[PDB]
Write a protein that binds this ligand. Structure first.
Ligand code: MG
Ligand code: MG
Ligand code: MG
Ligand code: MG
Ligand code: MG
Ligand code: MG
Ligand code: MG
Ligand code: MG
Ligand code: MG
Ligand code: MG
Ligand code: MG
Ligand code: MG
Ligand code: MG
Ligand code: MG
Ligand code: MG
Ligand code: MG
Ligand code: MG
Lengths: 178, 206, 116
RNA sequence: CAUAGCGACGUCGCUUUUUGAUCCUUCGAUGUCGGCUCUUCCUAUCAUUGUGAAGCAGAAUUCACCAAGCGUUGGAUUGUU
RNA sequence: CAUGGUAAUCCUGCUCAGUACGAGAGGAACCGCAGGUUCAGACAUUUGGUGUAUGUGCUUGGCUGAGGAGCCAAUGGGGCGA
RNA sequence: AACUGCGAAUGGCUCAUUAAAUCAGUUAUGGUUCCUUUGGUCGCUCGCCACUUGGAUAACUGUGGUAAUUCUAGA
RNA sequence: CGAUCGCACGCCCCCCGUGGCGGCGACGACCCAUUCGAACGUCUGCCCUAUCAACUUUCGAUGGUAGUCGCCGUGCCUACCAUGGUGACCACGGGUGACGGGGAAUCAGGGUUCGAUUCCGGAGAGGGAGCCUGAGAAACGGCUACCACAUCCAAGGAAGGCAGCA
RNA sequence: CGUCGCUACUACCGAUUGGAUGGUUUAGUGAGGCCCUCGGAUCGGCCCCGCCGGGGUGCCCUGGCGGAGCGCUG
């Protein structure tokens, strides 16, 4: 049962291959969006509290929050529920979804670290990938650079420097709104 | 679903009519609102043309007009006392268009002292003195007292309404349609209609 | 030691215990004893029988605020860069606004000269 | 090709599970058919064990020997045997 | 232990083997394995039956003034039941 | 590319159903709704952001599941 | 009771010197009117059949009263009442190898047959049934369920609707 | 002209509580949608307030960890 491990404060999600029942028993019979101390995955995962954020069934069916069962059910899914995007407006389609309780019968199990452990997981907590593009709204950059009122707002926007080999150098700035 | 078509009915001669099409949307129906009495709960349904209808599922207040006195106050509905259509609507306390209900007389009373300067519904007085003492005397001038005692000659209320004010509850007939407008507006029963409904309620019980 | 099954009452059914019932529609049920089997066959609802597990969990028998935000670097502006930008409070920003205002002032004087 | 398997014309026997023949016992009474149930016995063996023979290539079948240990059923119609 | 009784029986499938034999069509057997039929001797862990433990609920008519607790109706009836 | 808006209820096909039903002419909606167009109306209301307020989500980066789909999940 | 988007850009400067004014549009709107309509209504009109003469009426049949619901008028539905309503001037039932009409064939006059078929109106998308969105659908080159067919599967599931053009 | 005898064809009656395929329905079961009454897996705001902080001057303008107020709420 693979584990898709992701740390939001740095990004750098990674997939973990484990096959030990004893290691995975700490997750069993836990609902989604619950924080469980992931200290059963050896010494390296000690001191880690992780949140169960979802997964997929043995047949690739994603799990839906609030189903409150183990196994698969069929639900009439409307716009904006989960596990479904409407092909046309107002369309609702019946689909199969996995329950929120996790057991051995899964392919993956999406996990999100809530609080940091005592050491650094290799390839996970390091090499912090930045957020690509900064705020576009004027208020959202006022909050980010702590502006009071109208102090060089135009030039305090984030400029995106992009380079390619055949490209002649140039910077890119967004059209700031509101 | 619930259809309001005329083709499922028999012909005037009694012959069986055969439908030439399956059920159409514009000839639909919807479940009854069944407006009870309780905390305000109104549901919005979409209707033909994209307009809006209000399903008053539960109501507690309604705008009832005195009529004779041209007094229109937002008061509280207590219970349903009589319904011409069905007795079960009285038993289940369901608000429909023509059922008559008991409503509080407090705002109408307050308007009556504030306009006519007469006790109404009181038994002996001297019970709300820091307000009624002020509103009886008012130490007002000659012209204001001239207006007030000019308004005394027409300050007669029917003994039936006087009894209802003594009891503290007026009985009034709804005029709006809950489940269509989502409110319970109405008018205070008085005169011959009040006597007719009083005789109906008396003949029903006791 | 085999696969453990659950009954009409939700109890564990050990190997060699109870019966198993396969319906025509393709559903297979297993019962712990003839009491549960007779209750199921008489179409009695387990949520209304006091000793079944479903009733116990229906009647609850026997059994805060968090909001944290982090600051991250942006492509083209590191954490050091954004800290340098956002920590210009001690009247440096006043210098920026006043110099921008006076620069726009000579710009507006040029506009007035070339306008009328 | 008489005799693998049959056997005409004749002729010698065995059995008492057929029906007769007789009238010895029973007429101061031996309860008279069939079915059901249940046990045992016979072999003139349908099957099964071991065999011999064939017009026994195999398969199937037929004849015979030792042989009665074991088995020989469920029903429609009929009181039926 | 004298003596007496005595009991086990038959079939099918797989393999041998589409093999031997046969022009072909067809088509075995010995050893081995897995099971059944009839019979016999038991036994109740499980499944089923019984059930007046007159065990525990439900319920009709009646009776103890009512509640509670009960009883009668040749086992009142019914569900589950050691 | 995607979010949003609009269209997708027109067109095309066929004649099974349907015998005061459809339909044809006539008349009514003073018993109803109406996208769009066009034209009115939009300072009529006395009542520490307005030099412009808040949050999320697409598209996008990355990690995947299922044999499969115009399936989608986590970050 | 507009926190929207483009186009050229101009005017006032006393108070001053950074602010206030301005045109052309686009988008937008509660409501009204108009347009496109749609929906239910009024009167008259349809082939054969009595070896179909009495139908409707508990479960609405005809009407009244009060409501419910519907976009609205109405038994559309509910409650309480009344006993009505339709028929030899053919009711009701059955058949149709019946979608209706504008029309087509035949042609003294009168008629008799045919109109699935390009225009108008209606109905349906395999048979039913139920809904989301939207002004407008009971939509099917939208969804859901059953029934009948039927596609792929790694057997755990998934996907269907040519009475559109070929 | 009719019976009778032969050969064809066409219908008719006929035990068989005959047979088949449509259609309309009683009754029982009853998927699914819609509505109502509940329900509450989760997701947010306030009360943050264990603290460093604080400025018109312990009396916070709050710039964050953090417990969680174990409530009010949508
Ligand atoms: Mg903009
Ligand atoms: Mg003699
Ligand atoms: Mg004797
Ligand atoms: Mg004897
Ligand atoms: Mg012998
Ligand atoms: Mg011996
Ligand atoms: Mg023996
Ligand atoms: Mg009793
Ligand atoms: Mg008692
Ligand atoms: Mg007796
Ligand atoms: Mg029993
Ligand atoms: Mg629209
Ligand atoms: Mg037809
Ligand atoms: Mg035509
Ligand atoms: Mg047409
Ligand atoms: Mg249609
Ligand atoms: Mg459809």
């Amino acid at each position: 049962m693979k584990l898709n491990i992701s740390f939001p404060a740095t990004g750098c999600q990674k997939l973990i291959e484990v096959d030990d029942e004893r290691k995975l028993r700490t997750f069993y019979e836990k609902r989604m969006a619950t924080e469980v101390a992931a200290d059963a995955l050896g010494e390296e995962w000690k001191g880690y509290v992780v949140r169960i954020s979802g997964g997929n069934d043995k047949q690739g069916f994603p799990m839906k929050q609030g189903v409150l069962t183990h196994g698969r059910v069929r639900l009439l899914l409307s716009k904006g529920h989960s596990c479904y995007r409407p092909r046309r407006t107002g369309e609702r389609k019946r689909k199969s979804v996995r329950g929120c309780i996790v057991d051995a019968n899964l392919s993956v199990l999406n996990l999100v670290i809530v609080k940091k452990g005592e050491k650094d997981i290799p390839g996970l907590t390091d090499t912090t990938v930045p957020r690509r593009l900064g705020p576009k709204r004027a208020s959202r950059i006022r909050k980010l650079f702590n502006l009071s009122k109208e102090d060089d707002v135009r030039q305090y926007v984030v400029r995106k420097p992009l380079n390619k080999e055949g490209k002649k150098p140039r910077t890119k700035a967004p059209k700031i709104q509101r | 679903g619930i259809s309001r078509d005329n083709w499922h009915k028999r012909r005037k001669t009694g012959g069986k009519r055969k439908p030439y099409h399956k059920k159409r949307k514009y000839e639909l129906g919807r479940p009854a609102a069944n407006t009870k009495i309780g905390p305000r709960r109104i549901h919005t349904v979409r209707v033909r043309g994209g307009n809006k209808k209000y399903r008053a599922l539960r109501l507690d207040v309604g705008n009832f007009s005195w009529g004779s006195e041209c007094c229109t106050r937002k008061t509280r509905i207590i219970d349903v006392v009589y319904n011409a259509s069905n007795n079960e609507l009285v038993r289940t306390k369901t608000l429909v268009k023509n059922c008559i209900v008991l409503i509080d007389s407090t705002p109408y009373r307050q308007w009556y002292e504030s306009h006519y300067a007469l006790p109404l519904g009181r038994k002996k007085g001297a019970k709300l003195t820091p307000e009624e003492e002020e509103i009886l005397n008012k130490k007002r001038s000659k012209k204001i007292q001239k207006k007030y005692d000019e308004r005394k000659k027409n300050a007669k209320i029917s003994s039936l309404l006087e009894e209802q004010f003594q009891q503290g509850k007026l009985l009034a007939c709804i005029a709006s349609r809950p489940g269509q407008c989502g409110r319970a507006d109405g008018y205070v029963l008085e005169g011959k209609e009040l006597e007719f409904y009083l005789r109906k309620i008396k003949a029903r019980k006791g | 030691m085999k696969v453990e099954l659950c009954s009409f009452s939700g109890y564990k059914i050990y190997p060699g215990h109870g019966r198993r019932y396969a319906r025509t529609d393709g559903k297979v049920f297993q019962f712990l004893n003839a009491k549960c089997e007779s209750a199921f066959l008489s179409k009695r609802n387990p949520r209304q029988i006091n000793w079944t597990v479903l009733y116990r969990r229906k009647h609850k028998k026997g059994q805060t605020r968090r909001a944290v935000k982090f600051q991250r670097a942006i492509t083209g502006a590191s954490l050091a860069d954004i800290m340098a930008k956002r920590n210009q409070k001690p009247e440096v920003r006043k210098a920026q606004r006043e110099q921008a205002i006076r620069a726009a002032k000579e710009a507006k004087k040029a506009k007035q000269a070339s306008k009328k």
